[PDB]
Structures are given as C-alpha cells and as structure tokens.
C-alpha cells in the first residue's frame, strides 16, 4: 500500500485504490431424470472430481456412468 520509492509505484496502488423513459423501458426489455447416488460417488473417486462436477457430468449423459466416463477421457 503506497510504498514510498518511485512515487508512481505508490501511485499504481493509488490508481488501483436525464431522459429516463427510454432507459427504463430498455431495462425492462433487458429482463431431470432421477439419478443414482452411488454413481456420483464412483466418479468422484476415480476422476477426482468434486461431487458437484461428478453429478453434473452424470446429468449430462442421463445418469449413464459408463457413458459419462467414456466421454470424459476423450481428448480434444
């Protein structure tokens, strides 16, 4: 935080430290198949993924663990 030398290196820290109607309208304008718990536990251990990513991966392939694992190890 604002170290003395160079003055600027201190400054680098320092720099780093009504027609509404169209707008309002513009802004208002601006705005599952049950899964097996064990499959999720198998993938977490063997792919070393978080429970979230393991579940998500299974969900991407309709709970087919063998399909999901085969897909994941395919290279670009």
């Amino acid at each position: 935080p604002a170290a003395k030398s160079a003055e600027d290196r201190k400054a680098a820290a320092a720099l780093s430290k009504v027609d509404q109607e169209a707008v309002k309208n513009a802004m208002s304008a601006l705005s599952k198949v049950k899964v097996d718990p064990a499959d999720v536990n198998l993938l977490v251990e063997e792919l070393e993924l978080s429970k979230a990513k393991a579940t998500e991966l299974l969900k991407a392939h309709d709970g087919d663990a063998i399909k999901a694992m085969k897909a994941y190890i395919q290279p670009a």
Partner: protein, 666 residues
Amino acid sequence: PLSTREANLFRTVIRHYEDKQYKRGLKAAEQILKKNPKHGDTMSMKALILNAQGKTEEAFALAKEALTIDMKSYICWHVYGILYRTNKNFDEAIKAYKFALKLEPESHQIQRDLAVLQIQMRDYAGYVQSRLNMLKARPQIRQNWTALAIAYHLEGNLEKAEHILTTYEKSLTTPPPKTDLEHSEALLYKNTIIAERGDIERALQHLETDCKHCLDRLAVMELRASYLSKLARKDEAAKAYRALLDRNPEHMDYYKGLISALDISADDEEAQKAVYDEYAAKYPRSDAAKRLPLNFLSGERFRTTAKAYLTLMFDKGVPSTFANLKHLYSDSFKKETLASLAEEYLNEYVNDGSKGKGAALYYLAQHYNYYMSRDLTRALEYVEKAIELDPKNVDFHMTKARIFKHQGDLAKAAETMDYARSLDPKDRYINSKAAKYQLRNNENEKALATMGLFTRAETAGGPLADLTDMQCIWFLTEDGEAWQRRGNTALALKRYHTVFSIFDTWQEDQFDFHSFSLRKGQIRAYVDMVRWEDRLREHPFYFRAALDAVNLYLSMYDKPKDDDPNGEKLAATKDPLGDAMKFLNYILQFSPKNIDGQIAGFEVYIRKKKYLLALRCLKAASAIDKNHPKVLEQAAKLRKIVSSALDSMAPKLREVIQAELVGVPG
C-alpha cells in the same frame, strides 16, 4: 440486544473505522463488549480492525468465532468475506460475501464487491446478473452499460452484448466530439464484437460509417485492411495495407497482406521483389524491406540479393545479422551460399571496433556453431580470428563460450562467458548469461554472486531475495534445476514452488483491474487480459518448472515470516504424489498438447492407484504421437496391471478400462 447507549457506541465504531482511527474504535467497541460480550456485530468489527493492523491470524479466528455466535448476522459474514478477499481465498470469500448479501440485499457497496469476485472466478452467469442489477440502480452512467455488455460478451452472448452497447448509444441526444476517448473506445469494442459474430460485412460498414475518425488510428487502419482482404476487395485492401506500411515498415505481416491483395503467386519470385524494393527505396531504414525477400528468392537471385544485404550489415557492423538469417538454413542451398558469400566478402574487403572484416568473420563463426551447418572446429578458428582483430568485443567471446558449451566442456564455457562479462561490467545481459553458464556448470554459489552485481544492494536476504521479489523466473528455474542435479532436493523444490507462487500472483494481479478498466474505459485491453489470464499457465515459463517438480517428486517416490527457507520440509514429505497434483493439474489443463506432460501425468496416476486417469493421460499421449517409445511401454504396463488387479476393483471400472484400452496400441 444492545439497546441504545450501546446503539450510539456501535455507530461511533463505524465512524472511526471510516476515519481510519483504529485505536479509538477498538476502545469504543470494547465498551460494548463489556456490556454485550456475545454481540457478534461488535466482535467482528473488532476482528476487522486487527486485520487492518496485520493480525490476520487472530483476526480470522475472531471473525470465525463471531460468525458462529450469530450465523444470521450479515456483518459477521461480510467481515468474514472481507478478510478472505484480503487473504486471496476467493472461493470462501465469494461464498461468504454471498451470505451477507443474502441477509441484506440492495446494499450497493456489497453488490459491487460481489461482482468483482464473480468475474474473478469467471462466474459469468453471476456476473451478468450482477451487472444488470447494478445497471438498473444507476443507468445514467455509461460505465454500467459497458460493464453489462462486457458480462454478456464474456458469457458468449454476443448478440445481447451488442444490444446493450447499441441501446446506450441510441439514448445520446448529441454526438460526442471526436476528442472524447471513452466513446471512441466504446465504438471499437462494439466493432470487434460485430466481427466476432463473424459479420465481417457489417463490421466494415460500421467501421467506415461510425468509427472513421476514432482516435486509435492503428486499430482503425488494421481492421480496415483485415476486413477488406477477407471480403476479397483486393485493390482497396492493397491500398489499406499501404497506409499501414507507411506507419511501420518493420512488421512482417503488413507486406504479406499487401502481396496477397495484388494476386502475386509465391512462385513468381521477381514480381515479389519488386514490391519489397519499392519500400526499400522509400524507407532506407527498414530492415524488414531488405531482409524478407531472402525468404522466397532462390538460385542466383538469392545470391545476388544476399550479398547486397550482407554488405550493408557487415559494413554497418550489425551483430544480429546471422541470427536474423539462420531460419533460412533449413534449405541447404541458401545455407551454403551465405557462408560462401561471407568468405567472398572477406577477401574482397578494402579498408574502429568490429566493424567490417571482423563482423563478416563473426557471421562465419556463428555459421559453423549453428546446429544445421555445425563444424565446431572451423567456428573456433573464425571466432579466434575475430577476437584476434577485436579483443574487447563482448559478443565475440560470448559466442566462443557458446562453442565450448557445444563441445560439452561446460567449465571452459562458463569461464569464457564470465570473462566476456568482465569487458562490459555495466551491461546486465552478459552478466545474466555468465550467471546462467555458471549454473549450467553447477556452480550455484558463484552464479548468485554474479547476479549480485545488479540486484538492489541493501535488500535483506541478499540477491536471491531481490530476484524473488522482482519475479525473476529464469534464474529461479535454472537454479532449481542446478540444485536438483546436485542432489539438493530441498532447494530445488523450493525454487519450483516459488515459480508456482509467482504464477498465483500473476493470476491474482488482475483483481484490481476488473474495476480499474471500467474507469479508463479501455475495454478491449481488459478483455485481452482476462482471456490471456484464461490461458495463463500455458506459458512455457510455468511448464518448465512444473514438470521439473513433478519429475523430482516421481524420483522421490521411488527412492524414499518464512516457514521453510531451505525447502527442507518439501524433501521430507510423506505424500510426494499428493504434493505434485497442484503442479500437474495446471500442466494437463492448460498444456494438453505436450506429450511430456501426459507421460508424466500417467506415471503420477498409476502410482496413485488411479488407473482411470492414467488411461486418459495414455489416450492423450497416444493421440499426439502414436509411436512414441514411452507411451508404448506405459500402455503395455497398464494392461499388465489391469489384468492382475481387476478382480478387486469395481466392474464398471474394469469395463470402461477394457473398452477404451483396446483402442490404444502398445
């Protein structure tokens, strides 16, 4: 809770904090804690002030303690988050920030801070939502529109990002003056977005109509040339590259651009040279305009031109001439011709430094040192003759040292390079080289002392400390590899980890800029940085040290205030394979095309008994180089392991293994 005398005391705790009066505020908060000792809000704020005075450790525990007392207090979680955000644990911070906002939404300061962490962890959906809310609260400021456009853009929603930008523009009653830099930058950002959707027709249209007079002149001129060429409007694109050519005669691609627009076939050698000569005549100081024609010229046409080029450079004494032409040595004819021409010039020479005859000899010296035409004995002779003519030339002796290196005599190479340093002690480049050569000869303590001639003097902890501070990755890596070669596992690991830590810093460096770039309005640069950051550790600077670490841990596995200054804890690890993962994960995720990474990943995972990840590594390595010697051995090694231990492991693993294993030839 606390009711009213205490109520005003809490308020003077907030006031003293916003006035940076820490002491009056602790004593003030303490008056509340004597009345309400389990008042979380007061306690966290006390936890807060300690952190603002480098008691991070106690501070965190106090905040953790405060949050347990009142888990439904929005101050405790915010504080908990603020501590986290200071301490770079962005993941618990994002989570903790999330609960404070969950207790008290609408708070503009908290939402601002939430959006930053969110873009920092590339939660695009979060960032989009965040900016939209923010835009809703303060829609008179252009920044909030651009910010939401940025959010949409990074999410992949280009159409909506363009919409947000265009919507703002339609609200402007008066056209801003061409001196307005914010507007200029906003237009080009929209323009690049039009192009990224692949609508080159429209982006060019928008360029000529709305961007014609933007202040970033190079950007406008290059986009124009790029777009015209892709649209095959060749005459006009030719003309566009000429405007650009006049600005910077030294940029290879502009000539390329021009020549394509003229419809000149690479076979027509003479027609291409005409183009280059026109600008060589027009811009006598362009090196490019003289040098580039040697790429496609051949036979006598090459010789004649190469002589004329060599004569310019040698007479001027330019030392980078060889280095500037050696790419051509893949073609044997051009290789031999250049050596013959140098020799021809030497004899033909008529009459201080290394200007002239010495300079030609140096080309030949380097010629026979280069691996495509290597003859180390003749090279030595030429360099000895150059040094004969000019004994104080740094670049000559430096090349000599490099020749010794190639003979394999590292000691002589370091001694000569170090001598080379002694001729220009004011010049750091040769100093770094000397240090480097000394490290290559495993002379560590000497090399650090060499570097010491240029590190800030009264740095505490000597040279090594300054170089670490100044993020000097080259030295750290080389020193580690040197220490490793000597069996010094402790310091080797310490160095590689330091390079790992330097990259964590670089990744965190972008934190203040998510906000900062909105003030400058310089948005394209901002998206460039995020995207560069998105591929940060693909840089060889990471890769080298990281593969070393992993390799050193692999070795360690088969042969069983600074908290660790000699890296002694590292060598004594009980889980080497575990300590390797943080290096490996980045290698595999950002550098997948490197077989070396995959082979090393495979070795780490089989040892880890994780046979599924091993195969993924194997399949990767095999896809890059089918017949690589290592992958065939490891492939054969896995199937032995699989056929043996398949009864103990679950059936789905056996099945997926066996299925995707036959693919792979071992």
